[PDB]
Design a protein around this ligand. Structure first.
Ligand SMILES: COc1ccc(O)c(-c2n[nH]c(=S)n2NCc2ccccc2C(=O)O)c1
Ligand SMILES: [Zn+2]
Ligand SMILES: [Zn+2]
Ligand SMILES: [Zn+2]
Length: 231
């Protein structure tokens, strides 16, 4: 039963094992009087944890580490932010203070710095060209090309067929485009095509926000992006 926007108060974080040593983390945040859910990933790396993305702010991210310290007991050693916006890097100073090594592509780090946002300390090399893939312990990092943002990465857990799409992939419940202020609408469908062509084997697909599904979430995102383009 995947945790939903309701059963999580803004300030709290729930974990949801997906497979052997793979969790999503689920948080909530208020924007413009509404409440939205947010997903990241946790991947066991021997006796320690890889974190993908913050829980959308300093308070939610301190809760996330406390919820990891109650429920799993292993130390987060590294974190990756999948793009430069506040829902992915907000909480990076909290991670750093606790001893977590924070990572992002040089492009994410430059865009975060221009935007004023928290800047992960470490640089991920070899992701500057669309279709680039690099190994990062128990996951592959993949730059599909510009989509939700010019810098957006996706993460694959070969051991488990878990594709974490971040904010480049929409949940089925989302039937209109969200925040596309920094998006490349022209390149978004091609970038999703590179994800399909690189990861046909994926069996679990986690959007940046809301429910996981199958690879149908890629075709869903393409349908929503194209409808928005033709507004
Ligand atoms: C200060 O934090 C914010 C506020 C508003 C925002 O749109 C964001 C944000 N930047 N990048 C993304 S993705 N953000 N969240 C977007 C969002 C949140 C919930 C549901 C759907 C979306 C979406 O626009 O795709 C971050
Ligand atoms: Zn964003
Ligand atoms: Zn997002
Ligand atoms: Zn659809």
């Amino acid at each position: 039963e995947y945790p939903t926007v309701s059963e999580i108060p803004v300030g709290e974080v729930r974990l949801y094992q997906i497979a052997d040593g793979v969790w999503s983390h689920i948080a909530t945040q208020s924007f413009d009087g509404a409440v939205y859910p947010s997903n990241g990933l946790i991947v066991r790396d021997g006796d320690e944890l890889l974190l993908i993305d913050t829980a959308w702010g300093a308070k939610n991210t301190a809760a996330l580490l406390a919820e990891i310290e109650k429920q799993i007991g292993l130390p987060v050693t590294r974190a990756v932010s999948t793009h430069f916006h506040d829902d992915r890097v907000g909480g990076v100073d909290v991670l750093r203070a606790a001893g977590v090594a924070t990572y992002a592509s040089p492009s994410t780090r430059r865009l975060a710095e221009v935007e004023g946002n928290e800047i992960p300390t470490h640089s991920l090399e070899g992701l500057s060209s669309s279709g680039d893939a690099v190994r990062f312990g128990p996951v592959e990092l993949f730059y599909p090309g510009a989509a939700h943002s010019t810098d957006n990465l996706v993460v694959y857990v070969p051991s488990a067929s878990v594709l974490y799409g971040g904010c480049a992939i929409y949940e089925l419940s989302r039937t209109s485009a969200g925040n596309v202020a920094d998006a490349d609408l022209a390149e978004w469908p091609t970038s999703i095509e590179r994800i399909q062509q690189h990861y046909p084997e994926a069996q679990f697909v986690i959007p940046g926000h809301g429910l996981p599904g199958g690879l149908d979430l890629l075709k869903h995102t393409t349908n929503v992006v194209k409808a928005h383009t033709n507004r």
